[PDB]
Amino acid sequence: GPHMKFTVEREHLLKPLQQVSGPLGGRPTLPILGNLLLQVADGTLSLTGTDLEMEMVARVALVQPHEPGATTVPARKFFDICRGLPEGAEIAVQLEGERMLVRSGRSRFSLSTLPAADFPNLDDWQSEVEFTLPQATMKRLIEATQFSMAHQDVRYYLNGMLFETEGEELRTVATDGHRLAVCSMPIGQSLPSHSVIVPRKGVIELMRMLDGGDNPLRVQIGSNNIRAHVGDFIFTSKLVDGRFPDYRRVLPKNPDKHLEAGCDLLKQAFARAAILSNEKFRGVRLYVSENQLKITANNPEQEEAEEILDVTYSGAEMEIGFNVSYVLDVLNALKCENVRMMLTDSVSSVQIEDAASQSAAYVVMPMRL
Amino acid sequence: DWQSEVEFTLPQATMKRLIEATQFSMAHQDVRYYLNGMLFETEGEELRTVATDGHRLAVCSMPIGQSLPSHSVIVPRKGVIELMRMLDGGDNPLRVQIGSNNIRAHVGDFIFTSKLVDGRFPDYRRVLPKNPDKHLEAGCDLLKQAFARAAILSNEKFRGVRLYVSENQLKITANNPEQEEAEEILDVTYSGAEMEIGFNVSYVLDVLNALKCENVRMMLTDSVSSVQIEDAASQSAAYVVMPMRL
Amino acid sequence: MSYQVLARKWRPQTFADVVGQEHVLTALANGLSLGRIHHAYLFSGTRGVGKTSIARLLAKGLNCETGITATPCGVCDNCREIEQGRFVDLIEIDAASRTKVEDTRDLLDNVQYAPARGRFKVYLIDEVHMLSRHSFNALLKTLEEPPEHVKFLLATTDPQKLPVTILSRCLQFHLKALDVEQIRHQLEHILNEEHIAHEPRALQLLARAAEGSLRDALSLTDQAIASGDGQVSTQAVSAMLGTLDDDQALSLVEAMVEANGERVMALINEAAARGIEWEALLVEMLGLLHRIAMVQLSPAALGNDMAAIELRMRELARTIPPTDIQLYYQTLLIGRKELPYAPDRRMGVEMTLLRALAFH
Amino acid sequence: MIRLYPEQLRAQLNEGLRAAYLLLGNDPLLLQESQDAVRQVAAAQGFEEHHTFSIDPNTDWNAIFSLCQAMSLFASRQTLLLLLPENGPNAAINEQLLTLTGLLHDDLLLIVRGNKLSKAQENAAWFTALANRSVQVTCQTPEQAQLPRWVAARAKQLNLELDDAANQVLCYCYEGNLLALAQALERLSLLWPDGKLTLPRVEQAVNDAAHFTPFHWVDALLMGKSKRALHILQQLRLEGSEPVILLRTLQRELLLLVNLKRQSAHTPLRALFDKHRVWQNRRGMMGEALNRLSQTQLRQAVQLLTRTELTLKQDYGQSVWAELEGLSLLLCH
Numbered sequence A: 001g002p003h004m005k006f007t008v009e010r011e012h013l014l015k016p017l018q019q020v021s022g023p024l025g026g027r028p029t030l031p032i033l034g035n036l037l038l039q040v041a042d043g044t045l046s047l048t049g050t051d052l053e054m055e056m057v058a059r060v061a062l063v064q065p066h067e068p069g070a071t072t073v074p075a076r077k078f079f080d081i082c083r084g085l086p087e088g089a090e091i092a093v094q095l096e097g098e099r100m101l102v103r104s105g106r107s108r109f110s111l112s113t114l115p116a117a118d119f120p121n122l123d124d125w126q127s128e129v130e131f132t133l134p135q136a137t138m139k140r141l142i143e144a145t146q147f148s149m150a151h152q153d154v155r156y157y158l159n160g161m162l163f164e165t166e167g168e169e170l171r172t173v174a175t176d177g178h179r180l181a182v183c184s185m186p187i188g189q190s191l192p193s194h195s196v197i198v199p200r201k202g203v204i205e206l207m208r209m210l211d212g213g214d215n216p217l218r219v220q221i222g223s224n225n226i227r228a229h230v231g232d233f234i235f236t237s238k239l240v241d242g243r244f245p246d247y248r249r250v251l252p253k254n255p256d257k258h259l260e261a262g263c264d265l266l267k268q269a270f271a272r273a274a275i276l277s278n279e280k281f282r283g284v285r286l287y288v289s290e291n292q293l294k295i296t297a298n299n300p301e302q303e304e305a306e307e308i309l310d311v312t313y314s315g316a317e318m319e320i321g322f323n324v325s326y327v328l329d330v331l332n333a334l335k336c337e338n339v340r341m342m343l344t345d346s347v348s349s350v351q352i353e354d355a356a357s358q359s360a361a362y363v364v365m366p367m368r369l
Numbered sequence B: 001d002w003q004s005e006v007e008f009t010l011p012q013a014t015m016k017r018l019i020e021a022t023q024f025s026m027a028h029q030d031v032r033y034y035l036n037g038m039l040f041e042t043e044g045e046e047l048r049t050v051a052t053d054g055h056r057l058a059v060c061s062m063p064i065g066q067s068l069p070s071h072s073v074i075v076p077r078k079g080v081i082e083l084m085r086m087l088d089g090g091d092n093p094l095r096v097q098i099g100s101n102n103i104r105a106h107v108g109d110f111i112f113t114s115k116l117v118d119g120r121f122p123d124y125r126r127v128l129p130k131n132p133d134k135h136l137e138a139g140c141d142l143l144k145q146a147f148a149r150a151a152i153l154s155n156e157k158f159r160g161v162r163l164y165v166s167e168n169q170l171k172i173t174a175n176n177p178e179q180e181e182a183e184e185i186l187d188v189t190y191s192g193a194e195m196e197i198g199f200n201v202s203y204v205l206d207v208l209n210a211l212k213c214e215n216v217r218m219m220l221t222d223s224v225s226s227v228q229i230e231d232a233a234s235q236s237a238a239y240v241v242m243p244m245r246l
Numbered sequence C: 001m002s003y004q005v006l007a008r009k010w011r012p013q014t015f016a017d018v019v020g021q022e023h024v025l026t027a028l029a030n031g032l033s034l035g036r037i038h039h040a041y042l043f044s045g046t047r048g049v050g051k052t053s054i055a056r057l058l059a060k061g062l063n064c065e066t067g068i069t070a071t072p073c074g075v076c077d078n079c080r081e082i083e084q085g086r087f088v089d090l091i092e093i094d095a096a097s098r099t100k101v102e103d104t105r106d107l108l109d110n111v112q113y114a115p116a117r118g119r120f121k122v123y124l125i126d127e128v129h130m131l132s133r134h135s136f137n138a139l140l141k142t143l144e145e146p147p148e149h150v151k152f153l154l155a156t157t158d159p160q161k162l163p164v165t166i167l168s169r170c171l172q173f174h175l176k177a178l179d180v181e182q183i184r185h186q187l188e189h190i191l192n193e194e195h196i197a198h199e200p201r202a203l204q205l206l207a208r209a210a211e212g213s214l215r216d217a218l219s220l221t222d223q224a225i226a227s228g229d230g231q232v233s234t235q236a237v238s239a240m241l242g243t244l245d246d247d248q249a250l251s252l253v254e255a256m257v258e259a260n261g262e263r264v265m266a267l268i269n270e271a272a273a274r275g276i277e278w279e280a281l282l283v284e285m286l287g288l289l290h291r292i293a294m295v296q297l298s299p300a301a302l303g304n305d306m307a308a309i310e311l312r313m314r315e316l317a318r319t320i321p322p323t324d325i326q327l328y329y330q331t332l333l334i335g336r337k338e339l340p341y342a343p344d345r346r347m348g349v350e351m352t353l354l355r356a357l358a359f360h
Numbered sequence D: 001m002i003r004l005y006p007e008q009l010r011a012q013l014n015e016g017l018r019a020a021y022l023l024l025g026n027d028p029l030l031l032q033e034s035q036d037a038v039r040q041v042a043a044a045q046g047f048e049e050h051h052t053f054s055i056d057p058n059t060d061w062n063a064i065f066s067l068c069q070a071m072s073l074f075a076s077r078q079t080l081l082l083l084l085p086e087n088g089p090n091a092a093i094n095e096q097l098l099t100l101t102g103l104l105h106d107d108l109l110l111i112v113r114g115n116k117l118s119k120a121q122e123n124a125a126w127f128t129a130l131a132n133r134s135v136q137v138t139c140q141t142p143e144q145a146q147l148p149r150w151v152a153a154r155a156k157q158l159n160l161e162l163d164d165a166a167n168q169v170l171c172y173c174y175e176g177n178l179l180a181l182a183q184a185l186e187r188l189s190l191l192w193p194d195g196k197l198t199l200p201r202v203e204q205a206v207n208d209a210a211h212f213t214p215f216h217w218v219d220a221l222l223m224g225k226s227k228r229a230l231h232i233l234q235q236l237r238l239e240g241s242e243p244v245i246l247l248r249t250l251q252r253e254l255l256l257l258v259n260l261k262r263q264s265a266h267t268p269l270r271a272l273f274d275k276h277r278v279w280q281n282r283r284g285m286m287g288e289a290l291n292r293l294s295q296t297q298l299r300q301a302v303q304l305l306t307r308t309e310l311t312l313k314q315d316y317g318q319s320v321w322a323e324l325e326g327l328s329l330l331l332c333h
């Protein structure tokens, strides 16, 4: 009757248990947050584990006879019993009173459990944004914009990605002060305008839960949390508050002097500059001339390096000294064959873009000279 | 200056087996200073290694083929641990030197030296039960797996299991301060009265780990006496587990 | 047949049900209604004064569908989820449990994430004065620029250990220990609503024994009901308070001064039944005499420690000449000197009080 | 440079922001208010964002130095706030500050906050490097003599009418705790929009949050204010101060006073004060103490102090506060 009946081989239960064991750290803020929520319903077992900030749920199909139910069981206990059985063990878990009875041949366990209804409240989510996209684009967005995320900053909002979910072009933006990275991809369907800031703990988990396959990535975004969906595994992450500086407002609109250069040669030059770079402010200067890029590396130890790059330019003479890491990681994320860019004197943003596509862009500001 | 009271010319793998049989059942910083070590005993062509801590006893009695006068010395825990750290699984003929106060070992191209604990090791013979009438003979690996399964939920601060012995089935029951129960059943061949006996599952598991055999025999007397564990097909080494109060 | 504990069953649910702390309630209401709520509110009072109750009510005011206001509503979703203790983003932290700077940092990593429900993510830390200095500095650093929907609530019994810099970040409220009148009236209301027969003198004894704390009053009321089968008479409360009495040294001084031998004997026998160490009793008697002498020297010698028995101490200082105080102090000093070598000290203390009474 | 007080920085800030501001003082409230005013004026003049760094032996000087040459992608201007330790700078921190001073430019409204530096720290390369145009603001706590005037002036600033009795009560309850004093003024303004804070109106909304040092108690004893001395003892005990340091300062100044009283019949008080290196601000107080205190009172005070220290150092430490109050009363007769 009130006996959540459950029966599965341990092979189909080992991996989902490990998947839902992520948020379960050492000491949970709430006591019940140190447990797993087990639900047998509609011929499916749902495993839920939460950290009051992120939730991971794994679903497994059920073929053995069962009775629907729900119960919250100790995390590390249940995992230890499930893992400690011999290979091929057929675990049969039942609910008697307030106890999980785990039976397997001649082995019997009676674990103490918490009511299912006392596990926070994983409801009230009325998502206003819902979209499914291929894995390649989801990976590419964060490949493009992960480097430019600020970490351990007083401004909380700078520590997370911004998914700009508006119109049809889905965008991801990450600005670490001077560094700005934006990437736009068409997903297929129109949708209202939203700007959602996802914490680093959310995107770092997203990257581990994206794998190659036929996954549609049914992403549901609400006002305070974002949720991702693979067919068997689903994930939830809260959102970091604060506003966000408008990337489009700091994009160079008026100026039009364009510079073109290769990628790999710039890679080698900037990597050589980074080797034994400036001790304190590891940034170097450049003099842009007509179809010419001179780069100088200066150090507090008088160390000087000068190189000349043959490029395409149709503008004026400018002198601009940046931080090498910023442009290095910008080019690394852009990963194209040739880069178009613009940079002007005084205080003006250096824009870097793929010469073949405008789906991604980067903004870097030099230092004082 | 050295007077070798007892000199062994023995295979190093042999004493490796001897020490590995009894290493775990040893006292660490115990009040009884004479137990903070391991007893080397010599009886004719037989070398014996005894180690106890008041809750466990592990004796390994192995023939060596060479006759020596009877003797008994105690080597501290640090000395035997260092010997095991240095002892390997090779063919070098190890040479043990026993004096009045010190232990020495010539091992291929290495020399190991240590002092001896000034004390008298207790007589292990009376520790062994004198009426080993009840016998539980079962596969060693099956017992290890069952005990590990029952000890999954056992806590470090509360480690202990109750054995219910019946006509055939052996029941291992484990509780915890969280008040959750674990039970395992085995088809050990047995014939005797039903009984209940509690021991620390860690000590029993260590005893089984020391026994690399296909099956073992446990000798039992009653619910309040110690239990002996031995190889069902060999008498080279025996173990004693003192029961816990319930 | 519930018969639940009257302490939490009668915790205030609306601000109008809080006894005392009227200025604090007015300030909170004014901040909730017209002004902008300060980013951090600290509460400091005595044991059983209302601190956590006020903080919980303020958090209820913060998160509610009616909006951020003083008296939001009744039986709403957020108000009920707080009253049942099941609210998600109403984080409740014991500072002593998380004095470690690492645990504090982990706690302060949660402020960035948005609230799960309501409007504001409210943190309620109890006994905040026990936080380590590094954890306290981290708390100040997260309080200088909090998120626009993240608020902190702090409580502590003794705010004197808090560094002054906490005043630079949070608005503090001090809750005055309730007097006899307010505690007595609240207990009368509780008993009237619970249909408990009682007498006004019993309520007065309970309130005086409470020593300003309403939780103490409720606990003593529960004990009085338990012993008296609901019939809370004056004699029952008086007897069960005498069972808990520990003012023996003061009564001994009063009776020894009054040359009341039988009273001193009864009180010393009661102290023996209490199982009190005699050396400690004699040294605290010496302390009481010294305090009487000092308050005779100057009225300001007294503090808030003896603010429970200050009336009798003032009377003793007024009525007793200093020469008698010096003689009694010398007698008790020599009695304590000779106590270890006396017979069983239960009678050594007696005979020292005898010598004191001899100066009549 | 330009050395000012909190009442003058508001007028100075409208004359044009300088290269750097040094907020020096032991009062958290004055430092906080001056920093807030500087930040508000900077925001008015175009400084949008601000960065805070506490100077620690593990200070990321590379981060701050890069911040000197860190431009602003989306922002335009920037400030830079430094929180000096309680003991001030040393060789390494002062060299880093000298480099930072060399790194100032049109932007970088460098703000420095901490406690007042010593004469040795005064004569330093970094301090002289910005010694042409920086603005230094003294933010020391007003003492007992000037506290009533200060609280009256702030009440006038806050459009609050205060009485002499209310001023005395606020100075008594919140001495050395002007953060709590301003919070109390704001609370009284909120509770009573009338603004006429009578004595009963302030008696019901203040709590004893004053903070004292042992030197405050020593000065109270020297002046002979028994009530003030007992209040200081109560505040120190509630704060949890160790009585040993109180006994130590008492012993030092009492031994000096006993020497002075013994030598008074031989040498005039002026030369005795000069030889014993007595500060000018306390010479009158100590002369008054010498005049009031007799040799018998000094001997009794030494006896009581010796008994108290013997009680403490024998690992008992029981009711030492009663003995301290006894000594306080004895020295105030």
Ligand SMILES: Nc1ncnc2c1ncn2[C@@H]1O[C@H](COP(=O)(O)OP(=O)(O)O)[C@@H](O)[C@H]1O
Pocket: C006, C007, C008, C010, C011, C012, C017, C018, C019, C020, C021, C045, C046, C047, C048, C049, C050, C051, C052, C053, C054, C214, C215, C218
């Ligand atoms: N002002 C008050 N109004 C109503 N009940 C109170 C009040 N102060 C204390 N109590 C009672 O005491 C119990 C505990 O109160 P609490 O506010 O936790 O005291 P504390 O200040 O020591 O944390 C409450 O459940 C309530 O019953």
Ligand code: BEF
Pocket: C046, C047, C048, C049, C156, C157
């Ligand atoms: F909860 Be209180 F401070 F007793």
Ligand SMILES: [Mg+2]
Pocket: C051, C052, C126, C155
């Ligand atoms: Mg409390």
Ligand SMILES: [Zn+2]
Pocket: C060, C063, C064, C065, C066, C072, C073, C074, C075, C076, C077, C078, C079
């Ligand atoms: Zn409500």
